[PDB]
């Protein structure tokens, strides 16, 4: 079977734990410890094929680091999760796409906009902008609640279609 | 001097022949023949430097054309110019970037994002979702009118600052 490295990235506080908790152990971390930086793994079927998918839960400082330059490099497809009561969270997700250009030489690779909290009534980030910002960018767009699960196995399960088009 | 290949495109009617002959004559055209696909060579000094350009102000029908995928070929630079009064042609930006990626092989193509009758106080297309765009794209953005001469040597020199950039 294909095996694929995915990572999760965005700002702090946006859900990145929160989301591969969910997908991996099927329950919602109100208070995983933010230094924490792991993988984890979970064989998965997606349009009737299986694969073996080893997913990175990113977190570090602000800050330029060879290592992170490395998972960058190993990595196939990359979420890019933003909050939708956060608009800094929003407009950092060029920047972190910007790096992941830098390190991967390319501006084709795998990647799914993750708009996540989506079941808090208010957001100051509108759909209509995020689905704009990834149609410039050429990506899917999921809206997510890792509170309620609502999405999260679609957000990974694309990510998954996206290094299979891809290769 | 170097020479450069600039291609004006956008969608119908949102003033490209307007911008490249009050670039090139200096007046303002009102109704000009939206048949003709011309170029018009023109010596600019930018940045203290002097290029010539060989500009194309493009004219078409919607459809695939070999002859259009040669211009896009040779072209250097491209402008993609959109009225800001007409939300079609802005969201038609995107796909005349996909034509000029595809025939230029992904290339990091230069271009400039136009948002033109910025004299215009009927605007539909926000200037906030123009620069988010032309951020996306990682591209300059440039608001201009070819009826008041608002930002038209800036356009056309932006291009062909990005064409440099890219050279080097
Ligand atoms: N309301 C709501 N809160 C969320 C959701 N996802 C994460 N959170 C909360 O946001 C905080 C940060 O989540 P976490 O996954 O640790 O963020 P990380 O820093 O990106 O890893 C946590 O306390 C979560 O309870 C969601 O979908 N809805
Ligand atoms: N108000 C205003 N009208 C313009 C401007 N630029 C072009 N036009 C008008 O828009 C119409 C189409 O312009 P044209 O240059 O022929 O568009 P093209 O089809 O893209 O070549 C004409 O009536 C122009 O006079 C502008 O900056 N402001
Ligand atoms: S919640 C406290 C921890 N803070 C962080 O984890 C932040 C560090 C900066 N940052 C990023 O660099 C996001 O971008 C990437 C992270 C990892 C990888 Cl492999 C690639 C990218 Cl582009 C936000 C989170
Ligand atoms: S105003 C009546 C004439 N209509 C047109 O000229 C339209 C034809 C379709 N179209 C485009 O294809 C714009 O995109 C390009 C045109 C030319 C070149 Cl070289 C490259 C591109 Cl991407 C809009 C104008
Ligand atoms: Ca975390
Ligand atoms: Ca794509
Ligand atoms: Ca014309
Ligand atoms: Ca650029």
Same mark, same amino acid.
């Given at each position: 079977? *294909?095996?694929?490295?995915?990572?999760? @990235? #965005?700002?702090? !506080?946006?859900?990145?734990? =929160?989301?591969?908790?969910?997908?991996?152990? +099927?329950?919602?971390?109100?208070?995983? &410890?933010? *230094?924490?930086? &792991?993988?984890?793994?979970?064989?998965? @079927?997606? &349009? !009737?094929?299986?694969?073996?998918?080893?997913?990175?839960?990113?977190? #570090?400082?602000?800050?330029?680091? =060879?290592?992170? /330059?490395?998972?960058?490099?190993?990595? %196939?497809?990359?979420?890019?999760?933003?909050?939708? +009561? +956060? *608009?800094?969270?929003?407009?950092?997700?060029?920047?972190?796409? %910007?790096?992941?250009?830098?390190?991967? &030489?390319?501006?084709?690779?795998?990647? @799914?906009?993750?708009? +996540?909290?989506? /079941?808090?009534?208010?957001?100051?980030?509108? $759909?209509?902008?995020?689905?704009?910002?990834?149609?410039?960018?050429?990506?899917?767009?999921?809206?997510?609640?890792?509170? $309620?699960?609502? #999405? @999260?196995? /679609? =957000?990974?399960?694309?990510?998954?279609?996206?290094?299979?088009?891809?290769?």
């Amino acid at each position: 079977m *294909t095996e694929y490295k995915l990572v999760v @990235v #965005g700002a702090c !506080g946006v859900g990145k734990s =929160a989301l591969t908790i969910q997908l991996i152990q +099927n329950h919602f971390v109100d208070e995983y &410890d933010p *230094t924490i930086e &792991d993988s984890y793994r979970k064989q998965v @079927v997606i &349009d !009737g094929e299986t694969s073996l998918l080893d997913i990175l839960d990113t977190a #570090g400082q602000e800050e330029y680091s =060879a290592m992170r /330059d490395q998972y960058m490099r190993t990595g %196939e497809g990359f979420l890019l999760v933003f909050a939708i +009561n +956060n *608009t800094k969270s929003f407009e950092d997700i060029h920047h972190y796409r %910007e790096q992941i250009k830098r390190v991967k &030489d390319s501006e084709d690779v795998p990647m @799914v906009l993750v708009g +996540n909290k989506s /079941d808090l009534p208010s957001r100051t980030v509108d $759909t209509k902008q995020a689905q704009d910002l990834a149609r410039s960018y050429g990506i899917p767009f999921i809206e997510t609640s890792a509170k $309620t699960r609502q #999405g @999260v196995d /679609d =957000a990974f399960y694309t990510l998954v279609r996206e290094i299979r088009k891809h290769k």
